[PDB]
Design an enzyme around this catalytic site. Structure first.
Site, PDB file in Angstrom:
ATOM      1  CB  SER A 188     -69.198 -76.424 -39.954  1.00 58.98           C
ATOM      2  OG  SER A 188     -68.285 -77.257 -40.648  1.00 58.98           O
ATOM      3  CE  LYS A 240     -64.824 -75.040 -40.372  1.00 64.44           C
ATOM      4  NZ  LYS A 240     -65.685 -76.246 -40.482  1.00 64.44           N
ATOM      5  CB  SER A 275     -67.316 -75.697 -44.052  1.00 60.90           C
ATOM      6  OG  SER A 275     -68.438 -74.847 -43.905  1.00 60.90           O
ATOM      7  NE  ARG A 302     -76.958 -76.892 -44.696  1.00 63.69           N
ATOM      8  CZ  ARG A 302     -75.661 -77.062 -44.923  1.00 63.69           C
ATOM      9  NH1 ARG A 302     -74.855 -77.387 -43.920  1.00 63.69           N
ATOM     10  NH2 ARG A 302     -75.168 -76.912 -46.147  1.00 63.69           N
TER      11      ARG A 302
END
Ligand SMILES: [Cl-]
Ligand SMILES: [Cl-]
Ligand SMILES: [Cl-]
Length: 239
Positions: A43, A46, A91, A225
């Site tokens: 993702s 993006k 997402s 993350r």
């Protein structure tokens, strides 16, 4: 002198982080070898996809709607009409697969090579809606930084309007003291899964570009993350 590896070992995750201080042209990092290793962008792509989609005009602006096709997908927020700002927030893969198809293989390859994004490989035309999810496109954390930094200083082939729109939808967290922009990623087609958080922090009249890359071996790893990014920035006196 700061130990950015401390947050990783506290949370029991393996990975890396790279932070680039724009004003001082200085790096801070943990696990330098991994910062030069290539991974599926997932993702995080993006960010690039949004720029090309707006620049080519396959999506007109940040509120233009693409409608849900009625297929029940994994997450309920995906099963609804949306725009690029909310698709970025959520997402929403199917939205960006439409964008990639409408951009098309030839235009996508041109922008990939002009920008110099990652390993520059998007595969065959038949892979136009999955090359960043399954391969062959890969990118290193260093190359995430380079892409974001070039983006921010207006070197890439995108109009000011395109930049303004994408930088706005990237806003993740904001206080009077800082603006944190970024995008998570989660590549699940490889083992171990790969977690991303890339972006940049505006604070103290400076810009700190960051790229976090971790192994995800259980669902609790995914929350690390952003958390290791947070702890790293605070270790530098930021946020
Ligand atoms: Cl919106
Ligand atoms: Cl989600
Ligand atoms: Cl997932």
């Amino acid at each position: 002198n700061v130990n950015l590896g401390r947050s990783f070992n506290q949370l029991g995750i393996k990975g890396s982080i790279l932070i680039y201080d724009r004003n001082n042209k200085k790096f801070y990092e943990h696990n330098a070898a991994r910062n030069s290793q290539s991974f599926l962008p997932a993702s995080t792509f993006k960010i690039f996809n949004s720029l090309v989609a707006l620049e080519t005009g396959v999506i007109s602006n940040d509120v233009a709607i693409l409608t849900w096709d009625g297929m029940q997908r994994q997450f309920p927020t995906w099963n609804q009409d949306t725009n690029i700002r909310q698709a970025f927030r959520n997402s929403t893969v199917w939205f960006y697969q439409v964008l990639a198809r409408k951009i098309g293989h030839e235009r996508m390859e041109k922008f990939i090579k002009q920008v110099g994004y990652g390993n520059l490989q998007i595969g065959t035309p038949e892979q136009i809606d999955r090359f960043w999810l399954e391969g062959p496109l890969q990118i290193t954390p260093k190359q995430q930084i380079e892409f974001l930094q070039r983006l921010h200083r207006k070197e890439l082939p995108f109009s000011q309007r395109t930049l303004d729109l994408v930088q706005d939808i990237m806003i993740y967290e904001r206080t009077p003291n800082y603006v944190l922009r970024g995008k998570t990623g989660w590549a699940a087609s490889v083992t171990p899964n790969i977690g991303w958080f890339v972006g940049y922090l505006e604070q103290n009249n400076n810009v700190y570009f960051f790229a976090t890359n971790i192994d995800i071996r259980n669902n609790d790893d995914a929350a690390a993350r952003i958390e290791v990014t947070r702890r790293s920035l605070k270790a530098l006196g930021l946020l």
